[PDB]
Amino acid sequence: VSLVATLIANPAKAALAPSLGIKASAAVNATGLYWLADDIACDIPLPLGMEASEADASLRATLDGAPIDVVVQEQERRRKKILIADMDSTMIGQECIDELAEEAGLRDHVAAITARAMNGEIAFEPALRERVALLKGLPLSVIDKVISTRITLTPGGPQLVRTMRKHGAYTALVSGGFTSFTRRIAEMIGFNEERANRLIDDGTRLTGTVAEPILGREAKVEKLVEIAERVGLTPEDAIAVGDGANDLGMIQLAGTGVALHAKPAVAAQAKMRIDHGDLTALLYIQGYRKADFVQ
Ligand SMILES: [Ca+2]
Ligand SMILES: [Cl-]
Numbered sequence: 001v002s003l004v005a006t007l008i009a010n011p012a013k014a015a016l017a018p019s020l021g022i023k024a025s026a027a028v029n030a031t032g033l034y035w036l037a038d039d040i041a042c043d044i045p046l047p048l049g050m051e052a053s054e055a056d057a058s059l060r061a062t063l064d065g066a067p068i069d070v071v072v073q074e075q076e077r078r079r080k081k082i083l084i085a086d087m088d089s090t091m092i093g094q095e096c097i098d099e100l101a102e103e104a105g106l107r108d109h110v111a112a113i114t115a116r117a118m119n120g121e122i123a124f125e126p127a128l129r130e131r132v133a134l135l136k137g138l139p140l141s142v143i144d145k146v147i148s149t150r151i152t153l154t155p156g157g158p159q160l161v162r163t164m165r166k167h168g169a170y171t172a173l174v175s176g177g178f179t180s181f182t183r184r185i186a187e188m189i190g191f192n193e194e195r196a197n198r199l200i201d202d203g204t205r206l207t208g209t210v211a212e213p214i215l216g217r218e219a220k221v222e223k224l225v226e227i228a229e230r231v232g233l234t235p236e237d238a239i240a241v242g243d244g245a246n247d248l249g250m251i252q253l254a255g256t257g258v259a260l261h262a263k264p265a266v267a268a269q270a271k272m273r274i275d276h277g278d279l280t281a282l283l284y285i286q287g288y289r290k291a292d293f294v295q
């Protein structure tokens, strides 16, 4: 089966120089070298008979000290037809739950719990109830307040979703956060649908509870299964991306699963990781060229 290695830099620190790409491809006795974006990403088709683990270590040693990610995969079925993406710290810069906690004067106390939950040291569901209970009494106006003043989109997000939709993919934003945030964020970026938990309120204030059953790690796996079956595909046809322990189920089930700027224990578990590039990395992973992007 044919293999291809892809080298990916951050467009904001585009250090994949021509000379560097040439040296990488020689390190793996490669046939050709194909640029997907100048100074940012290139394809290196491995010669037949090389294990992916060899090419990976060879390329990483050659590139050591440079902010360039490495992934190796089979050339066929690179381009996926489903995207399922985590929201918090993946498509936006923030944790909505931590920003909400600010409005209760408890950002640090809640953020410390969030860090433990996204690292996998506590189960998602009791972590969520403990954090949300501290939001009891907040007026419903704080949701618009946080969205309009403190939530920012991750670089490359809109381009990723729009370029994939251009090529017929179905895109879903699937989050352990809250519907009141995902519905607006999904609209801003351009997802086909979103699914998240739900804050309970009395009409004026937050009750401090969440609608049950809570969506955690397994619920993201289930949404991936539901989507693929509905659109007449299989999870093998999907690329999944996240940063946290609650994304590892869908990252492991999808055909391509990406730990993006993941927590230390999370990245330790994922087969494919992106630590330097932004969300356009997922376009290059799939073999797209800059000429293909929606600008
Ligand atoms: Ca996340
Ligand atoms: Cl909500």
Ligand SMILES: [Cl-]
Pocket: 251, 252, 257, 269, 270, 271, 272
């Ligand atoms: Cl994985």
